[PDB]
Coordinates of C-alpha atoms in Angstrom, one line a residue:
Chain A
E1 CA 123.0 -9.5 52.1
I2 CA 123.9 -13.1 52.3
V3 CA 121.1 -15.1 52.6
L4 CA 121.3 -18.4 54.4
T5 CA 118.9 -21.2 53.2
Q6 CA 118.4 -24.0 55.3
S7 CA 117.5 -27.8 54.6
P8 CA 115.4 -29.5 55.4
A9 CA 112.5 -27.8 57.2
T10 CA 111.8 -30.8 59.4
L11 CA 114.1 -33.8 60.1
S12 CA 112.2 -36.5 61.9
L13 CA 114.3 -38.7 63.2
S14 CA 114.3 -41.5 66.7
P15 CA 116.8 -41.2 69.7
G16 CA 119.9 -42.7 68.6
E17 CA 119.8 -41.7 64.7
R18 CA 122.0 -39.5 62.9
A19 CA 120.8 -36.0 62.0
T20 CA 122.3 -34.6 59.0
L21 CA 121.3 -30.4 58.8
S22 CA 122.3 -28.4 55.6
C23 CA 123.0 -24.4 55.2
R24 CA 123.7 -22.9 51.9
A25 CA 124.6 -19.5 51.6
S26 CA 123.8 -17.3 48.4
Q27 CA 127.7 -16.3 48.3
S28 CA 130.8 -17.5 50.0
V29 CA 131.1 -16.6 53.6
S30 CA 134.5 -18.6 53.9
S31 CA 134.1 -20.5 57.2
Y32 CA 132.4 -17.5 59.3
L33 CA 129.3 -19.7 60.1
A34 CA 127.8 -20.7 63.2
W35 CA 124.9 -22.9 64.2
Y36 CA 122.6 -22.2 67.0
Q37 CA 120.1 -24.7 68.9
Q38 CA 116.8 -23.7 70.2
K39 CA 114.4 -24.6 72.6
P40 CA 110.8 -23.1 72.9
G41 CA 110.1 -20.0 74.9
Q42 CA 114.2 -20.1 75.4
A43 CA 117.3 -18.1 74.1
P44 CA 119.1 -19.6 71.3
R45 CA 122.4 -21.7 72.2
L46 CA 125.5 -21.1 70.2
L47 CA 126.7 -24.9 69.5
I48 CA 129.4 -24.5 66.7
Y49 CA 131.7 -21.5 65.5
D50 CA 133.5 -20.7 62.5
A51 CA 132.0 -23.8 61.0
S52 CA 133.9 -26.5 62.9
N53 CA 134.7 -25.5 66.1
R54 CA 132.4 -26.4 69.2
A55 CA 131.5 -24.1 71.8
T56 CA 132.4 -24.3 75.1
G57 CA 130.0 -26.9 77.1
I58 CA 128.4 -28.5 73.9
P59 CA 129.1 -32.6 73.8
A60 CA 131.5 -34.3 70.9
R61 CA 128.4 -35.8 69.2
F62 CA 127.7 -32.2 67.8
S63 CA 130.2 -31.5 64.6
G64 CA 130.2 -29.3 61.5
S65 CA 132.0 -28.9 58.4
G66 CA 132.0 -27.4 55.4
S67 CA 133.5 -23.5 53.9
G68 CA 132.5 -21.1 51.3
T69 CA 129.0 -21.8 50.8
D70 CA 128.1 -25.3 51.9
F71 CA 127.6 -26.4 55.2
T72 CA 126.3 -29.0 57.3
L73 CA 125.9 -30.1 61.1
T74 CA 125.8 -33.0 62.1
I75 CA 124.9 -34.8 65.5
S76 CA 126.4 -38.2 65.5
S77 CA 123.6 -39.8 67.7
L78 CA 120.7 -37.7 69.1
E79 CA 119.8 -37.4 72.6
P80 CA 116.4 -36.6 73.9
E81 CA 117.4 -33.4 74.6
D82 CA 118.6 -32.7 71.1
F83 CA 114.9 -32.3 69.6
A84 CA 114.6 -28.2 68.8
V85 CA 115.0 -25.8 65.8
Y86 CA 118.6 -24.9 64.4
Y87 CA 119.7 -22.2 63.2
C88 CA 122.6 -21.2 60.9
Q89 CA 124.1 -17.7 61.2
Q90 CA 126.7 -15.9 58.9
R91 CA 129.4 -13.8 60.4
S92 CA 131.2 -13.1 57.3
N93 CA 129.6 -9.5 56.1
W94 CA 126.8 -7.0 57.6
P95 CA 123.9 -7.5 58.2
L96 CA 124.6 -10.5 60.5
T97 CA 121.8 -12.8 59.1
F98 CA 120.4 -16.5 59.7
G99 CA 119.1 -19.6 58.0
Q100 CA 115.2 -19.8 58.6
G101 CA 115.5 -22.7 60.9
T102 CA 115.4 -26.7 60.8
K103 CA 113.2 -28.5 63.4
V104 CA 114.3 -31.7 65.0
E105 CA 111.2 -33.6 65.8
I106 CA 110.9 -37.2 67.7
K107 CA 110.1 -39.7 64.6
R108 CA 108.2 -42.8 66.6
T109 CA 105.3 -45.5 65.2
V110 CA 102.6 -43.7 63.4
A111 CA 99.5 -43.5 65.9
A112 CA 95.9 -42.3 64.8
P113 CA 94.3 -39.8 66.6
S114 CA 91.3 -40.4 68.7
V115 CA 89.1 -38.0 67.8
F116 CA 86.1 -35.6 69.8
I117 CA 83.3 -33.4 68.8
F118 CA 81.8 -31.4 71.1
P119 CA 78.8 -29.3 70.8
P120 CA 78.5 -25.2 71.9
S121 CA 77.1 -24.8 75.4
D122 CA 73.5 -23.5 76.0
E123 CA 75.2 -20.5 78.3
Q124 CA 77.9 -19.7 74.8
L125 CA 74.5 -19.9 72.5
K126 CA 72.3 -17.5 75.1
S127 CA 75.0 -14.3 73.8
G128 CA 74.9 -14.9 70.0
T129 CA 77.9 -17.1 69.0
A130 CA 78.4 -21.0 68.5
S131 CA 81.7 -22.9 69.0
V132 CA 82.0 -26.3 67.8
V133 CA 84.9 -28.2 68.9
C134 CA 87.2 -31.0 67.6
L135 CA 89.7 -32.8 69.3
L136 CA 92.1 -34.9 68.3
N137 CA 94.2 -36.8 70.8
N138 CA 97.7 -38.5 71.0
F139 CA 98.3 -39.1 67.3
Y140 CA 102.0 -38.6 65.2
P141 CA 102.8 -37.6 62.9
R142 CA 101.6 -34.1 62.8
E143 CA 100.4 -34.0 59.8
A144 CA 96.5 -34.1 60.3
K145 CA 93.4 -32.9 57.9
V146 CA 90.5 -31.5 60.0
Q147 CA 87.5 -30.7 57.5
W148 CA 84.4 -29.8 59.3
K149 CA 81.1 -30.7 57.9
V150 CA 77.4 -28.8 58.6
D151 CA 75.1 -30.9 56.7
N152 CA 77.3 -32.4 54.6
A153 CA 78.6 -28.7 53.3
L154 CA 82.4 -29.0 53.3
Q155 CA 83.3 -25.4 55.6
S156 CA 86.4 -23.3 55.2
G157 CA 87.9 -20.4 56.5
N158 CA 85.8 -20.5 60.0
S159 CA 87.7 -22.7 62.0
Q160 CA 90.9 -22.1 63.5
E161 CA 93.5 -24.9 65.1
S162 CA 96.2 -25.3 67.5
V163 CA 99.0 -28.2 68.4
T164 CA 100.3 -29.0 71.2
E165 CA 104.1 -29.6 71.6
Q166 CA 105.3 -33.2 71.0
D167 CA 105.2 -35.1 74.4
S168 CA 108.1 -35.6 76.4
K169 CA 106.6 -39.0 77.4
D170 CA 105.1 -40.7 74.0
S171 CA 106.2 -38.3 71.4
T172 CA 102.6 -37.7 69.9
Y173 CA 100.9 -34.5 69.4
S174 CA 97.1 -33.5 70.3
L175 CA 95.3 -30.3 68.1
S176 CA 92.0 -28.6 68.9
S177 CA 89.8 -27.3 66.0
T178 CA 87.2 -25.2 66.5
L179 CA 84.5 -23.9 64.1
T180 CA 83.1 -20.7 65.0
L181 CA 79.6 -19.3 63.5
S182 CA 76.7 -16.8 64.4
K183 CA 73.6 -18.2 66.9
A184 CA 71.2 -18.0 64.1
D185 CA 73.5 -19.7 61.3
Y186 CA 74.2 -22.5 64.2
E187 CA 70.2 -22.9 64.5
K188 CA 69.7 -23.7 60.8
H189 CA 71.6 -26.6 60.4
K190 CA 71.3 -30.1 62.0
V191 CA 74.4 -32.3 61.5
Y192 CA 77.6 -31.1 62.6
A193 CA 80.7 -33.2 61.6
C194 CA 84.4 -33.2 62.2
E195 CA 86.2 -35.3 59.8
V196 CA 89.4 -36.4 60.4
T197 CA 92.2 -37.5 57.7
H198 CA 95.5 -39.0 59.1
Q199 CA 98.0 -41.3 57.7
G200 CA 97.6 -43.4 61.2
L201 CA 93.7 -43.9 59.8
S202 CA 92.9 -46.2 57.1
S203 CA 90.3 -44.3 55.9
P204 CA 89.0 -40.5 57.5
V205 CA 87.1 -40.7 60.9
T206 CA 84.1 -38.6 61.1
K207 CA 82.9 -37.8 64.5
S208 CA 79.4 -35.8 64.7
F209 CA 76.0 -35.2 66.5
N210 CA 72.8 -33.8 65.7
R211 CA 72.0 -30.3 66.9
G212 CA 69.5 -30.8 70.2
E213 CA 69.6 -34.2 70.5
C214 CA 70.7 -37.0 72.7
Chain B
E1 CA 129.0 -14.7 86.0
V2 CA 128.3 -13.2 82.8
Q3 CA 124.6 -12.5 82.5
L4 CA 122.5 -10.4 80.2
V5 CA 119.2 -9.5 81.7
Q6 CA 116.4 -8.2 79.6
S7 CA 113.7 -6.1 81.2
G8 CA 109.8 -7.4 81.4
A9 CA 107.1 -8.4 78.7
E10 CA 105.3 -5.5 77.3
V11 CA 101.6 -5.3 76.1
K12 CA 101.0 -2.2 73.7
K13 CA 98.9 0.1 71.5
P14 CA 99.7 0.7 68.0
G15 CA 100.9 3.8 68.1
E16 CA 102.4 4.1 71.6
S17 CA 106.0 4.8 72.6
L18 CA 108.4 1.8 73.9
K19 CA 111.9 1.3 75.1
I20 CA 112.9 -2.1 76.1
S21 CA 116.3 -2.8 78.0
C22 CA 119.5 -5.1 78.6
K23 CA 121.6 -5.3 81.3
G24 CA 124.9 -6.6 81.3
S25 CA 127.2 -7.8 84.5
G26 CA 129.7 -10.1 85.3
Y27 CA 132.3 -8.0 82.6
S28 CA 133.3 -5.0 81.4
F29 CA 129.8 -3.9 79.4
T30 CA 131.9 -0.9 77.4
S31 CA 134.0 -3.8 76.0
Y32 CA 131.8 -6.0 74.1
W33 CA 129.3 -4.7 70.9
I34 CA 125.7 -5.7 72.0
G35 CA 123.1 -6.8 69.5
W36 CA 119.2 -7.0 69.3
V37 CA 117.7 -9.8 67.3
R38 CA 113.7 -10.0 66.8
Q39 CA 112.2 -13.1 66.7
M40 CA 108.3 -12.9 65.4
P41 CA 105.8 -15.3 66.3
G42 CA 106.1 -18.8 64.8
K43 CA 109.0 -17.6 63.0
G44 CA 112.8 -17.6 62.3
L45 CA 115.8 -14.7 63.9
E46 CA 116.7 -11.6 62.6
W47 CA 119.6 -9.2 63.2
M48 CA 118.2 -5.9 64.3
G49 CA 121.0 -3.8 64.6
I50 CA 124.2 -3.7 66.9
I51 CA 126.0 -1.2 69.6
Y52 CA 129.3 -0.5 71.1
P53 CA 128.7 0.9 74.8
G54 CA 131.8 2.1 75.0
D55 CA 131.2 4.8 72.1
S56 CA 127.5 4.0 71.2
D57 CA 129.1 3.2 67.9
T58 CA 125.9 1.7 66.3
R59 CA 124.9 -0.4 63.3
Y60 CA 121.5 -0.9 62.0
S61 CA 120.3 -3.9 59.9
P62 CA 119.1 -2.4 56.7
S63 CA 115.7 -3.5 57.1
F64 CA 115.7 -2.0 60.8
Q65 CA 117.6 1.0 59.8
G66 CA 115.3 4.2 60.6
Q67 CA 112.8 1.7 61.9
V68 CA 114.3 1.8 65.5
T69 CA 116.9 3.6 67.9
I70 CA 119.1 1.3 69.6
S71 CA 121.3 2.9 72.4
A72 CA 123.4 2.0 75.6
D73 CA 123.7 4.1 79.2
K74 CA 127.2 2.9 80.1
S75 CA 127.0 4.4 83.4
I76 CA 124.7 1.6 84.5
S77 CA 125.4 -1.3 81.9
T78 CA 122.4 -0.9 80.0
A79 CA 121.8 -1.2 76.1
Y80 CA 118.4 -0.4 74.9
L81 CA 115.8 -0.8 71.8
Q82 CA 113.2 1.7 71.2
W83 CA 110.0 2.5 68.8
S84 CA 108.7 6.0 68.8
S85 CA 105.5 4.9 67.2
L86 CA 104.9 0.9 67.5
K87 CA 102.7 -1.4 65.2
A88 CA 100.6 -4.5 65.5
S89 CA 103.5 -5.9 63.5
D90 CA 106.4 -4.8 66.0
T91 CA 104.7 -7.9 68.0
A92 CA 107.8 -10.4 68.8
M93 CA 110.0 -11.4 71.1
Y94 CA 113.1 -9.3 71.1
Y95 CA 116.8 -10.5 72.2
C96 CA 119.6 -8.8 73.3
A97 CA 123.0 -10.4 72.5
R98 CA 126.7 -10.3 73.5
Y99 CA 128.7 -9.8 70.2
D100 CA 132.3 -11.4 70.5
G101 CA 134.5 -11.0 67.2
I102 CA 137.8 -12.3 68.4
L103 CA 127.4 -14.6 70.0
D104 CA 127.9 -16.2 73.2
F105 CA 125.7 -15.2 75.9
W106 CA 122.3 -14.1 75.4
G107 CA 119.4 -12.5 77.2
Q108 CA 116.3 -14.3 78.3
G109 CA 114.1 -12.3 76.1
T110 CA 111.3 -9.7 75.9
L111 CA 107.9 -10.6 74.7
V112 CA 106.1 -7.0 73.3
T113 CA 102.9 -7.8 72.1
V114 CA 101.4 -4.9 70.3
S115 CA 97.7 -5.2 69.8
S116 CA 94.5 -2.4 69.4
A117 CA 92.4 -4.8 71.4
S118 CA 92.0 -3.9 75.1
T119 CA 92.4 -6.5 78.7
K120 CA 89.2 -8.4 78.9
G121 CA 88.9 -11.8 80.9
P122 CA 87.6 -14.8 79.1
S123 CA 84.1 -16.9 79.4
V124 CA 84.9 -20.3 80.2
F125 CA 82.3 -23.1 78.6
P126 CA 82.0 -26.5 78.8
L127 CA 83.3 -29.1 76.7
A128 CA 81.1 -31.8 77.8
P129 CA 81.4 -35.7 77.3
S130 CA 79.3 -38.0 75.7
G131 CA 86.8 -46.6 77.5
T132 CA 88.5 -43.6 77.3
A133 CA 86.2 -39.9 77.7
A134 CA 87.5 -36.8 76.9
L135 CA 85.7 -33.3 78.3
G136 CA 87.3 -29.8 78.7
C137 CA 87.1 -26.1 79.3
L138 CA 86.6 -23.7 76.3
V139 CA 88.2 -20.4 77.5
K140 CA 86.9 -17.5 75.2
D141 CA 87.2 -14.2 74.4
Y142 CA 90.5 -12.6 76.5
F143 CA 93.2 -10.7 76.4
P144 CA 96.1 -10.6 76.6
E145 CA 97.8 -13.6 77.2
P146 CA 98.2 -15.5 79.1
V147 CA 95.9 -17.9 80.8
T148 CA 96.4 -20.4 83.3
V149 CA 94.1 -23.8 83.5
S150 CA 94.5 -26.4 85.9
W151 CA 91.8 -29.3 86.7
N152 CA 90.8 -30.1 90.0
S153 CA 93.0 -27.7 91.7
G154 CA 96.6 -29.6 90.2
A155 CA 95.1 -33.3 91.4
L156 CA 94.4 -33.9 88.1
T157 CA 97.4 -33.5 85.9
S158 CA 97.5 -36.8 83.8
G159 CA 95.9 -36.6 80.1
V160 CA 95.4 -33.2 80.3
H161 CA 96.2 -31.1 77.4
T162 CA 96.1 -27.5 77.3
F163 CA 96.0 -26.1 73.8
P164 CA 97.9 -22.9 72.9
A165 CA 96.2 -20.1 72.2
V166 CA 94.6 -18.7 68.4
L167 CA 94.1 -15.2 67.8
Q168 CA 90.9 -14.3 66.4
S169 CA 89.9 -11.6 64.0
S170 CA 88.4 -9.9 66.8
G171 CA 91.6 -9.1 68.2
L172 CA 91.0 -11.3 71.3
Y173 CA 92.8 -15.3 72.2
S174 CA 90.9 -18.1 72.6
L175 CA 92.2 -21.1 74.0
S176 CA 91.0 -25.0 75.0
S177 CA 91.9 -27.1 77.9
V178 CA 90.9 -31.1 78.0
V179 CA 91.4 -34.3 79.7
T180 CA 90.7 -37.7 79.1
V181 CA 89.5 -40.1 82.0
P182 CA 87.8 -43.2 82.3
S183 CA 84.1 -43.2 80.9
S184 CA 82.9 -45.1 84.3
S185 CA 84.5 -42.1 86.1
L186 CA 81.9 -39.6 84.5
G187 CA 79.0 -40.5 87.2
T188 CA 81.6 -40.5 90.3
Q189 CA 84.3 -38.3 89.8
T190 CA 84.4 -34.5 89.7
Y191 CA 86.1 -32.9 86.9
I192 CA 86.6 -28.9 87.6
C193 CA 88.6 -26.7 85.4
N194 CA 90.4 -23.6 87.3
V195 CA 91.0 -20.8 84.8
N196 CA 92.7 -17.3 85.6
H197 CA 93.5 -14.6 84.1
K198 CA 95.5 -12.5 86.0
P199 CA 95.5 -9.5 83.7
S200 CA 92.0 -8.7 84.1
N201 CA 91.9 -10.3 86.9
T202 CA 89.1 -12.8 86.3
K203 CA 89.5 -16.2 87.8
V204 CA 86.9 -19.1 87.3
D205 CA 86.0 -22.3 88.2
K206 CA 83.5 -24.5 85.9
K207 CA 82.2 -28.0 87.1
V208 CA 82.5 -30.5 83.7
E209 CA 79.9 -33.2 83.6
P210 CA 77.8 -35.0 80.8
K211 CA 75.0 -33.1 79.6
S212 CA 71.6 -34.1 80.5
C213 CA 67.9 -34.2 78.5

């Protein structure tokens, strides 16, 4: 089977910049290569067919070239609607295969997260589990490290996080991390801390609380 | 107008059977190949196979050969993708698409969730605040997706982030919704999160305010 390798994994560019995306095939596919665009919760949308031909409705800012094993999609100047995931697909041989996607993300000025820590509620504790939550609000770029500390002990494997889609108004991200421990474990310790490492922060920021105090 | 319409989302248990559908209109269904595509959560596209509804000529991608059955009922312009025994790993969004040789038209997708977990409504806990404050709601231990969360019955939309849910090891989802507000407002303005988890018919309104001592 023909393996399509896409690069870069993530393009960060500002509206107006030129986007250049690559698709490399494990053997020649001739000119039988399509590009698709996908926004979250939506079906993929055909942009380019047979390597260089615009599908109907597709604006002139989209173009492609390449044949054989090397292909490039170009968006000459990025519009707000162009930030999404782009897939290549080969139609040369069976099975039909796709690249693993390139995400085109909006670059803006770096912004440091505002960090907020939340103790578990008394109601939650009543039933035997503790969720300590940490919020990192309105930051760019996406990459951030949350490090949980319980009495200075670096915590690992007992947290989960998720990240909002890039904001349509100011192009930032927000991230929520939850530390989960048993009620019994929560009650052994004093200091619960969320340490945030981010490019927007000169040095890591820590927010904490002491269990049961105001 | 040419369109592919896929059947609704599905929530299933390992070992159950499932047949999802794709109906074509605005064209002669027997003249175009229909393919099925699998997209697993947070991942890329995979071609599953293809069928010509005119004669039910079917070809499977090698990875899917013998994992699923692709079929078509031409008398009603419908193609199908079925499993006789589902696994948790079958959890994915599934697209159908009209394949023209001489992939212009795609279905809207059918989300398929396969889990051993069972329907359960969330408990909603406060994320209490301590000139910008943050406060919110922790919507914990529910299945399946989705929950909806609004703040003050829709009157508060600015500065609200409702996070994508995380799937816990227990098989239940957990989600947080937060908002940032002026600190001076904390004693005067009311903040209530309105949570609803239709699948379990659990509706909750939680007032959030500074925890006193």
